[PDB]
Design a protein around this ligand. Structure first.
Ligand code: CL
Ligand code: CL
Lengths: 142, 142
């Protein structure tokens, strides 16, 4: 049920009860979000968090490419494109999942959306590894 | 697919790429845990996080009760018992949800498990408020 925000007449800087209530409410909220299948309308905002994380990573990689050997650029740049490829797929299977909300396809497109997301994480790790090999190659310094 | 942990020959203290890959992988993992319905076997560990959070809160409240007016104790102590009541319910509907994994009751007991968890969060907030009224009453100091 609904209640007003906690009283403003008490200092919370060292309020352990308040911190612990907070902790417990978050653990419950987190537990229910995992146990329950998120409503198709939550897809968009979840996908937005993943997109922001991706461009923050792509911007950073662009700031790193210049500082690396010319011979590593092509492979790195290709790794980046595979990621945008995974994002397009993700975004598109999301919209499809949302399209057929109450049909025999909702679950299948949802699965394909999850597979796209999974690929995006696998390919991010492979990018890190391609970047590390480039960095280590650069250290070819005596 | 499976790959070795990232190279140990590079310092990560200021590695923004590594931090960003990490961020993106977490956002993906978090997204999939929300979109997907967690397997009944994940219930236990999730419920353990909620239980630890509860006793940490109950221990803290026990350390606070003594410092409050004798007239507020009974109501506070009752608030605590309502929480252990919610935990028993939660634990029991979990086990039931796990019992009837592949029957016509799995989903219903799962729902009852979620209702218990929800009550636990609502009652934690009410406890905070009962504790705040006690604190403010204590300040009856001139
Ligand atoms: Cl507050
Ligand atoms: Cl590492």
């Amino acid at each position: 049920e609904i209640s007003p925000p906690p009283t403003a007449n008490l200092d919370r800087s060292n309020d352990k009860v308040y911190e612990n209530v907070t902790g417990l409410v978050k653990a419950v909220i987190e537990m229910s979000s995992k146990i329950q299948p998120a409503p198709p309308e939550e897809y968009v905002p979840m996908v937005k968090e993943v997109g922001l994380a991706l461009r923050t990573l792509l911007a950073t990689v662009d700031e790193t490419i210049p500082l690396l050997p010319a011979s590593t650029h092509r492979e790195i740049e290709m790794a980046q494109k595979l990621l945008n490829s995974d994002l397009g797929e993700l975004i598109n299977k999301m919209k499809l999942a949302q399209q057929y909300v109450m049909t025999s396809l909702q679950q299948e497109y949802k699965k394909q959306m999850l597979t796209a997301a999974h690929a995006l994480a696998v390919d991010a790790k492979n990018l890190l590894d391609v970047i590390d090999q480039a960095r280590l190659k650069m250290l070819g310094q005596t």
